[PDB]
Ligand binder design. Structure first.
Ligand SMILES: *[C@@H]1O[C@H](CO)[C@@H](O)[C@H](O)[C@H]1NC(C)=O
Length: 431
């Protein structure tokens, strides 16, 4: 895609903190940028759209290379069009704004580069307010193995780059991404909704889901891919699980793991109020070159340090962190193939972490599975009493996009106090 000039692109500021054991925490002047899928795309020499609703203009876009040459991504009115605001330390992402549904933004080091976080033998910490984030919605904070420049160095047809939010990829190898590898994804374009479609290519990469949640359920999930970095796929390589990527991931959702009273409204972690979420990425030898061996989770709310809940599933050791062994155990228990281990398990997740990953923050609804996988029974054809089926208490009928968008359009999530650095250094304790 080209870089448009009709609307100035001004990235909201979202300060973060980098922390070290000896030095404490220091501010970084990071920013956020809207993902390229949500943007206006128009002819480079004017105002005519290249994409409207759920279709491309085939005159401007007869093939992916010609489309990318002819079409430009432009600047965004963050609050007015997308319902995205920042105080400079707290990011509010509103659900419906006019005809726009949801958003995804990336954390930037500067106006042309995503922040590349290297979190081996490090931790990541943030505050979240899900008070107004219900069943069917997902306020997600996560890592993708994207390039810091959004792909510009690799793909001559991408002249827009990180400044315009290009180069997404994730463990689901999505085929709804409009620009991949510098080409518009227009081949065999198929409508999937009023504003969305899919093309013949998907875009794959390893993903660490630090946080997928609403006030009914939360999950943290590594998803390794056998490939390294952002990879365009065709055919069954795009196929979830069986292709390049573990689409399912090794998840730790307290409720799915057999503890139905840890996290939710009025629970130990009270989702009706803000709280702090710490995620630590331990290596087997406590070094940054070591092998990712454990992902630990600690919560803080009202100054109380809250350790993660323990698993309570027959056949699964009663642990409260993600490990290779916990993954093998919960996949057998749940009847899920260990696509995670097949792709290289925590070791492979860890090398993606070591190579550097981009932070995404988002609010969305789920046209495919209605968020049931997060907060209800899934699959919708399995017995809810079976281990792993039930992931929350949302109704099996909730989360249909058309219902949530009219009933709770002013839902939002707030992400704030973003910190990363040495293990134990982004937060403190005392007696
Ligand atoms: C790594 O740190 C852990 C604390 O989480 C500690 O228990 C262990 O002794 C350390 N291991 C090595 C080999 O230094």
């Amino acid at each position: 895609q080209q870089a448009g000039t009709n609307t100035a692109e001004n990235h909201p500021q979202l300060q973060s903190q980098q922390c070290t054991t000896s030095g404490g925490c220091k501010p970084l002047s990071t920013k956020v940028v809207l993902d390229s899928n949500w943007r206006w795309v128009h002819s480079t020499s004017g105002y005519t759209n290249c994409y409207t609703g759920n279709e491309w203009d085939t005159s401007l876009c007869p093939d992916g290379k010609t489309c990318a040459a002819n079409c430009a991504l432009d600047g965004a009115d963050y609050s007015g069009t997308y319902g995205i605001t920042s105080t400079g330390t707290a990011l509010t992402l509103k659900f419906v704004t006019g005809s726009n549904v949801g958003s995804r933004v990336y954390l930037m080091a500067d106006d042309t580069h995503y922040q590349l976080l290297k979190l081996l033998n490090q931790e990541f910490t943030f505050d979240v307010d899900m008070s107004n984030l219900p069943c069917g919605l997902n306020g997600a904070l996560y890592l993708s193995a994207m390039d810091a420049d959004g792909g510009m160095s690799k793909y001559p047809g991408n002249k827009a780059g990180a400044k315009y939010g290009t180069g997404y990829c994730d463990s689901q190898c999505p085929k709804d991404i409009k620009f991949i590898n510098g080409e518009a994804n227009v081949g065999n374009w198929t409508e999937t909704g009023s504003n969305t479609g899919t093309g013949s290519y998907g875009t794959c990469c390893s993903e660490m889901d630090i946080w997928e949640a609403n006030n009914d359920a939360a999950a943290f999930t590594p998803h390794p891919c056998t490939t390294t970095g952002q990879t365009r796929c065709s055919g069954d390589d795009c196929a979830r699980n069986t292709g390049l990527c573990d689409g399912d991931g090794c998840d730790f959702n307290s409720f799915r793991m057999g503890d139905k009273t840890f996290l939710g409204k009025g629970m130990t972690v009270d989702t009706s109020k803000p709280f702090t979420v710490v995620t630590q990425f331990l290596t087997n030898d406590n070094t940054s070159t070591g092998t990712l061996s454990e992902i630990r989770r600690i919560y803080i709310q009202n100054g109380k340090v809250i350790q993660n809940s323990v698993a309570n599933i027959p056949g699964v050791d009663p642990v409260n962190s993600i490990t290779d062994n916990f993954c093998a155990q919960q996949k057998t228990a749940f009847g899920d193939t260990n696509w995670f281990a097949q792709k290289g398990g925590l070791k492979q997740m860890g090398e993606a972490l070591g190579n550097g990953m981009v932070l995404a923050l988002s609010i969305w609804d789920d046209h495919a599975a209605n968020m049931l996988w997060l907060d209800s029974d899934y699959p919708t054809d399995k017995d809810p009493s079976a281990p792993g089926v039930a992931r929350g208490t949302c109704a099996t009928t909730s989360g249909v996009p058309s219902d949530v968008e009219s009933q709770v359009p002013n839902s939002q999530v707030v992400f704030s106090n973003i910190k990363f650095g040495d293990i134990g250094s982004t937060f403190s304790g005392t007696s």
